[PDB]
């Protein structure tokens, strides 16, 4: 497992506004804990699956 920005199949890291939205959405992502790294970024989990597809080196391209 590992921390990072959980991205859906499109490679889009879920965003957030508070820290509880990240911790929750994070638990669903299989992460133990997670907050919302604002700084113009998105949520942040801690415990995502190894293969857990997270922001790699591209942009959230729909389709």
Short mmCIF file of N, CA and C in Angstrom, two decimals:
data_model
loop_
_atom_site.label_atom_id
_atom_site.label_comp_id
_atom_site.label_asym_id
_atom_site.label_seq_id
_atom_site.Cartn_x
_atom_site.Cartn_y
_atom_site.Cartn_z
N UNK A 1 0.86 -1.22 0.00
CA UNK A 1 0.00 0.00 0.00
C UNK A 1 0.88 1.25 0.00
N UNK A 2 0.30 2.41 -0.15
CA UNK A 2 1.11 3.65 -0.16
C UNK A 2 0.18 4.87 -0.17
N UNK A 3 0.69 6.02 0.20
CA UNK A 3 -0.14 7.25 0.21
C UNK A 3 -0.09 7.89 -1.17
N UNK A 4 -0.92 8.86 -1.44
CA UNK A 4 -0.87 9.50 -2.78
C UNK A 4 -2.25 10.03 -3.18
N UNK A 5 -2.39 10.41 -4.43
CA UNK A 5 -3.70 10.94 -4.91
C UNK A 5 -4.45 9.84 -5.67
N UNK A 6 -5.46 9.29 -5.05
CA UNK A 6 -6.27 8.22 -5.67
C UNK A 6 -6.97 8.75 -6.93
N UNK A 7 -6.59 8.25 -8.08
CA UNK A 7 -7.23 8.72 -9.34
C UNK A 7 -8.15 7.62 -9.88
N UNK A 8 -9.27 8.00 -10.45
CA UNK A 8 -10.20 6.97 -11.00
C UNK A 8 -9.57 6.31 -12.22
N UNK A 9 -10.35 5.64 -13.02
CA UNK A 9 -9.79 4.98 -14.23
C UNK A 9 -9.30 6.03 -15.22
N UNK A 10 -9.83 7.23 -15.14
CA UNK A 10 -9.40 8.30 -16.08
C UNK A 10 -8.12 8.96 -15.57
N UNK A 11 -7.66 8.59 -14.40
CA UNK A 11 -6.42 9.20 -13.85
C UNK A 11 -6.75 10.58 -13.29
N UNK A 12 -7.86 10.69 -12.62
CA UNK A 12 -8.27 11.98 -12.03
C UNK A 12 -8.26 11.87 -10.50
N UNK A 13 -7.36 12.55 -9.85
CA UNK A 13 -7.31 12.48 -8.36
C UNK A 13 -8.53 13.16 -7.77
N UNK A 14 -9.35 12.43 -7.05
CA UNK A 14 -10.56 13.05 -6.45
C UNK A 14 -10.16 14.33 -5.70
N UNK A 15 -10.94 15.37 -5.84
CA UNK A 15 -10.60 16.64 -5.14
C UNK A 15 -11.31 16.69 -3.79
N UNK A 16 -11.28 17.81 -3.12
CA UNK A 16 -11.95 17.89 -1.79
C UNK A 16 -12.00 19.34 -1.30
N UNK A 17 -12.64 19.55 -0.18
CA UNK A 17 -12.74 20.92 0.39
C UNK A 17 -12.31 20.88 1.86
N UNK A 18 -12.59 19.80 2.54
CA UNK A 18 -12.18 19.70 3.97
C UNK A 18 -11.26 18.48 4.15
N UNK A 19 -11.02 18.08 5.36
CA UNK A 19 -10.12 16.91 5.58
C UNK A 19 -10.95 15.64 5.81
N UNK A 20 -12.15 15.78 6.30
CA UNK A 20 -13.00 14.59 6.55
C UNK A 20 -13.46 14.00 5.22
N UNK A 21 -13.57 14.80 4.20
CA UNK A 21 -14.01 14.26 2.88
C UNK A 21 -12.91 13.37 2.33
N UNK A 22 -11.68 13.68 2.63
CA UNK A 22 -10.55 12.85 2.14
C UNK A 22 -10.44 11.58 2.98
N UNK A 23 -10.50 11.72 4.27
CA UNK A 23 -10.40 10.53 5.16
C UNK A 23 -11.49 9.53 4.79
N UNK A 24 -12.68 10.01 4.62
CA UNK A 24 -13.80 9.10 4.25
C UNK A 24 -13.53 8.48 2.88
N UNK A 25 -13.61 9.28 1.84
CA UNK A 25 -13.36 8.76 0.47
C UNK A 25 -12.07 7.91 0.49
N UNK A 26 -11.20 8.19 1.42
CA UNK A 26 -9.94 7.44 1.51
C UNK A 26 -10.22 6.03 2.04
N UNK A 27 -11.01 5.93 3.08
CA UNK A 27 -11.33 4.60 3.64
C UNK A 27 -11.89 3.72 2.53
N UNK A 28 -12.69 4.29 1.67
CA UNK A 28 -13.27 3.50 0.55
C UNK A 28 -12.15 3.09 -0.39
N UNK A 29 -11.16 3.93 -0.53
CA UNK A 29 -10.02 3.62 -1.42
C UNK A 29 -9.10 2.57 -0.77
N UNK A 30 -9.46 2.10 0.40
CA UNK A 30 -8.62 1.07 1.11
C UNK A 30 -7.49 1.76 1.87
N UNK A 31 -7.54 3.05 2.00
CA UNK A 31 -6.45 3.75 2.73
C UNK A 31 -6.81 3.87 4.21
N UNK A 32 -5.82 3.82 5.05
CA UNK A 32 -6.04 3.93 6.50
C UNK A 32 -6.50 5.35 6.82
N UNK A 33 -5.76 6.33 6.37
CA UNK A 33 -6.15 7.74 6.66
C UNK A 33 -5.83 8.61 5.44
N UNK A 34 -6.37 9.80 5.39
CA UNK A 34 -6.10 10.69 4.22
C UNK A 34 -6.70 12.07 4.45
N UNK A 35 -6.00 13.10 4.05
CA UNK A 35 -6.53 14.48 4.23
C UNK A 35 -6.70 15.14 2.87
N UNK A 36 -6.94 16.41 2.86
CA UNK A 36 -7.12 17.13 1.58
C UNK A 36 -5.94 18.07 1.33
N UNK A 37 -5.03 17.68 0.48
CA UNK A 37 -3.86 18.55 0.19
C UNK A 37 -4.32 19.67 -0.74
N UNK A 38 -4.71 20.79 -0.19
CA UNK A 38 -5.19 21.91 -1.05
C UNK A 38 -4.04 22.42 -1.92
N UNK A 39 -3.42 23.52 -1.56
CA UNK A 39 -2.31 24.06 -2.38
C UNK A 39 -2.67 23.91 -3.86
N UNK A 40 -3.94 23.95 -4.17
CA UNK A 40 -4.36 23.79 -5.59
C UNK A 40 -4.04 22.37 -6.04
N UNK A 41 -4.51 21.38 -5.33
CA UNK A 41 -4.21 19.97 -5.71
C UNK A 41 -5.46 19.09 -5.55
N UNK A 42 -5.52 18.28 -4.52
CA UNK A 42 -6.72 17.39 -4.35
C UNK A 42 -6.61 16.61 -3.03
N UNK A 43 -7.43 15.62 -2.85
CA UNK A 43 -7.40 14.80 -1.60
C UNK A 43 -6.04 14.12 -1.44
N UNK A 44 -5.90 13.33 -0.41
CA UNK A 44 -4.63 12.59 -0.18
C UNK A 44 -4.90 11.41 0.75
N UNK A 45 -4.67 10.21 0.30
CA UNK A 45 -4.93 9.04 1.18
C UNK A 45 -3.61 8.50 1.73
N UNK A 46 -3.71 7.52 2.58
CA UNK A 46 -2.51 6.89 3.19
C UNK A 46 -2.83 5.41 3.41
N UNK A 47 -2.51 4.58 2.45
CA UNK A 47 -2.82 3.12 2.60
C UNK A 47 -3.46 2.58 1.32
N UNK A 48 -3.45 3.35 0.25
CA UNK A 48 -4.06 2.87 -1.02
C UNK A 48 -3.36 1.58 -1.45
N UNK A 49 -4.04 0.81 -2.27
CA UNK A 49 -3.51 -0.46 -2.78
C UNK A 49 -2.22 -0.22 -3.56
N UNK A 50 -1.34 -1.19 -3.60
CA UNK A 50 -0.07 -1.03 -4.34
C UNK A 50 -0.38 -0.60 -5.77
N UNK A 51 -1.06 -1.44 -6.49
CA UNK A 51 -1.41 -1.14 -7.89
C UNK A 51 -2.40 0.03 -7.93
N UNK A 52 -2.88 0.46 -6.80
CA UNK A 52 -3.86 1.59 -6.77
C UNK A 52 -3.42 2.66 -7.77
N UNK A 53 -4.14 2.76 -8.86
CA UNK A 53 -3.83 3.76 -9.91
C UNK A 53 -3.89 5.17 -9.33
N UNK A 54 -2.76 5.80 -9.17
CA UNK A 54 -2.75 7.19 -8.62
C UNK A 54 -2.15 8.14 -9.65
N UNK A 55 -2.33 9.42 -9.46
CA UNK A 55 -1.77 10.40 -10.44
C UNK A 55 -0.35 9.98 -10.83
N UNK A 56 -0.14 9.67 -12.08
CA UNK A 56 1.21 9.26 -12.53
C UNK A 56 1.92 10.44 -13.20
N UNK A 57 1.84 10.53 -14.49
CA UNK A 57 2.50 11.65 -15.21
C UNK A 57 1.62 12.09 -16.38
N UNK A 58 0.43 12.54 -16.10
CA UNK A 58 -0.48 12.99 -17.19
C UNK A 58 -1.56 13.90 -16.62
N UNK A 59 -2.66 14.04 -17.31
CA UNK A 59 -3.75 14.91 -16.80
C UNK A 59 -5.07 14.14 -16.80
N UNK A 60 -6.06 14.62 -16.09
CA UNK A 60 -7.37 13.91 -16.05
C UNK A 60 -8.07 14.06 -17.41
N UNK A 61 -7.80 13.16 -18.32
CA UNK A 61 -8.45 13.25 -19.66
C UNK A 61 -9.69 12.35 -19.68
N UNK A 62 -10.85 12.96 -19.77
CA UNK A 62 -12.12 12.21 -19.80
C UNK A 62 -12.16 11.27 -21.01
N UNK A 63 -12.92 10.21 -20.93
CA UNK A 63 -13.00 9.26 -22.07
C UNK A 63 -11.66 8.54 -22.23
#
